[PDB]
């Protein structure tokens, strides 16, 4: 007698993401040495933290010039990785292959104009449930920060992760109503002789950004 | 947090700047080895196919995530659906050897046949992009340069031949990647580009 | 999980709870190839083969 076994129904098909291996055909092959080559990366979320990329504003330019008039809003957009202003960064390009995310997103602002032009800015976040503010006075009641130009020409602000659920979606190109995660608003408080000077802005991941559930929508 | 812009040094600002709190992170799903370990379809040809990792379409998950590295290394697995018998041949071998049976040949057994092949190229590492081409006759130069800017020919894992090939899928093992490159998303025309999520 | 009929054994015994948690197993009888897609993903991904 030999060991009796019972072949089972519904088991053993092919699945394209199973955790098991194939059978070897060609043996005893040795590789050329490749140890310590320059420039390695293991997690795709470390080049997203070490290297930020430019935003996209109306006109195909990654910056916003100071206005000389009674309207003080520089740029305003929804908070989503599928937004139009984020369509060229490394963050959105990578996030289009996952379904959910959570954590912080960083923004960097750099001032360019000459040594005798000065300015002052402010940035706020408006959570969902009420239309966003149009004036700095009204936005002064949200979570905000405020800086100005000097010897150090850069600033960094972290958009907090605030929601009911523990994770949030990266999908749903809206082209419609019903914002879900809120807006962010950049304002210009005042300025001295800085007409035409630009402020470039970049984006990158945060300390505790996370990304889960890979998918393939052919983008 | 202020700093000098031109210096190109990394700087990160946490939510403790205005009284917040920093939470725990789990980043298992973005590892290179993990995410690149899955099958990807490829349009096959009838008789002879050259196994080259640049034949995955650039829009699929594996295709683009592979193309954001300049140099790479991996073993290979293939899954073929064929008729007749299937013969594999190592890197750099004559094309007459595709007819000889002593080379690893898998006899037909339905429905398909999954194999595991080593890395047999002479270089220490492969490349996704190569600057070798150093770059009336209007169309002449067009179709001359267009065919004069491919990759070198020794960047492949071998070849397979059968009486007819119907499917062919690639899977990478032990992937390593060097020197990142750009990776872009679909550019919306409107204020947002939205997938229609699962909803009735 | 709310597509089980309310009169069956599992259907009603499930419906006497307000909140719940569980993993899932499915058994499908089909023709062709079967593709699964996680929660909250675009409906175009139902055609791609890289998904399980």
């Amino acid at each position, epitope marked *: 007698g030999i060991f009796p076994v019972a072949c089972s129904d519904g088991y053993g098909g092919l699945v394209t993401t199973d955790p098991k291996t194939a059978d070897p055909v060609y043996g005893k092959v040795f590789n050329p040495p490749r140890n310590m080559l320059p420039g390695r990366f293991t997690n795709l979320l470390d080049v997203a933290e070490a290297c930020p990329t430019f935003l996209h504003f109306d006109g195909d330019v990654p910056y916003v010039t100071t206005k000389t008039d009674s309207d003080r809003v520089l740029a305003q957009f929804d908070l989503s990785l599928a937004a139009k202003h984020m369509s060229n960064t490394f963050l959105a390009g990578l996030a289009q292959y996952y379904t959910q995310y959570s954590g912080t997103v960083n923004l960097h602002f750099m001032f360019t104009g000459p040594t005798d032009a000065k300015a002052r800015y402010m940035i706020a976040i408006a959570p969902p449930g009420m239309e966003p503010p149009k004036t700095p006075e009204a936005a002064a009641h949200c979570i905000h920060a405020e800086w100005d130009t000097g010897l150090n020409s850069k600033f960094t602000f972290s958009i907090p992760y605030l929601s009911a659920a523990d994770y949030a*979606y990266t*999908a*749903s*190109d809206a*082209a*419609e*109503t019903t914002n879900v995660q809120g807006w962010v608003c950049l304002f210009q408080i005042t300025h001295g002789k800085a007409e035409g000077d630009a402020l470039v802005v970049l984006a990158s991941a945060g300390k505790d950004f996370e990304l889960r559930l890979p998918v393939d929508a052919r983008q | 947090t202020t700093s000098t812009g031109e210096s190109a040094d990394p700087v990160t600002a946490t939510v403790e700047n205005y009284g917040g709190e920093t939470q725990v992170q789990r980043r298992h799903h973005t590892d290179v080895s993990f995410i690149l370990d899955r099958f990807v379809k490829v349009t096959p040809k009838d008789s002879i196919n050259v196994l080259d990792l640049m034949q995955t379409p650039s829009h699929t998950l594996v295709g683009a995530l592979l193309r954001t590295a300049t140099y790479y290394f991996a073993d290979l697995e293939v899954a073929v659906k064929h008729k007749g018998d299937l013969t594999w041949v190592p890197n750099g071998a004559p094309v007459a050897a595709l007819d000889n049976t002593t080379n690893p040949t898998a006899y037909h057994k339905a429905p398909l046949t999954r194999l595991a092949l080593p890395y047999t190229a002479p270089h220490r590492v492969l490349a996704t992009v190569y600057n070798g081409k150093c770059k009336v006759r209007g169309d002449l130069q067009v179709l001359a340069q267009k065919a004069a800017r491919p990759l070198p020919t020794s960047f492949n894992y071998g070849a397979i031949k059968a009486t007819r090939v119907t499917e062919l899928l690639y899977r990478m093992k032990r992937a390593e990647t060097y020197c990142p490159r750009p990776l872009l998303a679909v550019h919306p025309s*409107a204020a947002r580009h*939205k*997938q*229609k*999520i*699962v*909803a*009735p | 999980l709310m597509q089980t009929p309310s009169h069956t054994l599992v259907g009603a015994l499930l419906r006497t709870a307000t909140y719940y948690f569980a993993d899932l197993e499915v058994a499908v009888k089909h023709k062709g190839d079967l593709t699964w*897609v996680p*929660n*909250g*993903a*675009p*409906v*175009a991904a139902l055609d791609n083969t890289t998904n399980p």
Partner: nanobody
Amino acid sequence: VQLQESGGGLVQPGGSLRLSCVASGTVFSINDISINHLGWYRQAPGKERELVAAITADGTSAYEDSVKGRFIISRDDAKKMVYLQMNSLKPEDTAVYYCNGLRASNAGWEPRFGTWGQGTQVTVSS
């Protein structure tokens, strides 16, 4: 993202019309579905555009009690098209029809949920 329609123009009252909704394809996003609730709107000259009918995800259909009982609506999801039947032609049909979707709030259906439509007009006058 923007729905096209066809089957309109200049037509005489008393015929038989079947307005057709040539959708852009409905690229609509994530698996959160079964909120597929389309509808039809009419628009009057200088007077606010009014609803006509609305179709729910599977089978329910409501109409404005002005046209109630006279029109028939149905959708074909297997090919992803929706149509509008026009029988019992009256002088009241002179309006531009918009094939669009609905919101299904607690009080009443809300509009798009879209950018806008183009429309097709059926003005009949004898």
